[PDB]
C-alpha cells in the first residue's frame, strides 16, 4: 500500500539558517520548532529559478528525511512562509 506515518512527504517546519555555503555545496537550517538541524542547499529551496539562502536568515520549510535517514529542509521560504520573487516568477 502507501506508507503514511507522516504527512506523506515532508512535514512543515520553521527555523533559521545555520549557514548556506555554495562552495561546500551544503548548508543547514536550525528548526525553531524542531530539534535536529536540517540540511539545506539550492536544490532544496522553494525556488526553481534563483535559489540561495543567507547564513543568518530565518526560514519556513518542509522537513523531509533523506535516504541517509538524515532529515533535510526543502521548499525553503521566508520565516512567515513568504515566497521570494526568485521562487518562480509571478510578475507582481
Curated annotation (Swiss-Prot):
Disruption phenotype: Early flowering, altered stamen number and impaired seed development. Residues 14-78 form the CSD domain. It is found in: Cytoplasm; Nucleus, Nucleolus. Coiled coil: none annotated. Mostly expressed in shoot apices, seeds and siliques, and, to a lower extent, in roots, cotyledons, stems, shoots, leaves, floral buds and flowers. Present in shoot apical meristems and siliques (at protein level). It comes from the Eukaryota. Induction: Induced by abscisic acid (ABA), transiently by ethylene, salicylic acid and water fload, but down-regulated by dehydration stress. Accumulates during cold acclimation. Accumulation during silique development is AGL15-dependent. The modification N-acetylserine is found at residue 4. Chaperone that binds to RNA, single- (ssDNA) and double-stranded (dsDNA) DNA, and unwinds nucleic acid duplex. Accelerates seed germination and seedling growth under cold stress, and contributes to enhancement of cold and freezing tolerance. Regulates flowering transition, and flower and seed development. Promotes seed germination under salt stress. May regulate respiratory oxygen uptake. Belongs to the cold shock protein (CSP) family. This is Cold shock protein 2. It comes from Arabidopsis thaliana.
Amino acid at each position: 500500500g502507501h506508507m503514511s506515518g507522516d504527512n506523506g512527504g515532508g512535514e512543515r517546519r520553521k527555523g533559521s539558517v545555520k549557514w548556506f555555503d555554495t562552495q561546500k555545496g551544503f548548508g543547514f537550517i536550525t528548526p525553531d520548532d524542531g530539534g535536529d538541524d536540517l540540511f539545506v542547499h539550492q536544490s532544496s529551496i522553494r525556488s526553481e529559478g534563483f535559489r540561495s539562502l543567507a547564513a543568518e536568515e530565518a526560514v519556513e520549510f518542509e522537513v523531509e528525511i533523506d535516504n541517509n535517514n538524515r532529515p533535510k529542509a526543502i521548499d525553503v521560504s521566508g520565516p512567515d512562509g513568504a515566497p521570494v520573487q526568485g521562487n518562480s516568477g509571478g510578475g507582481s
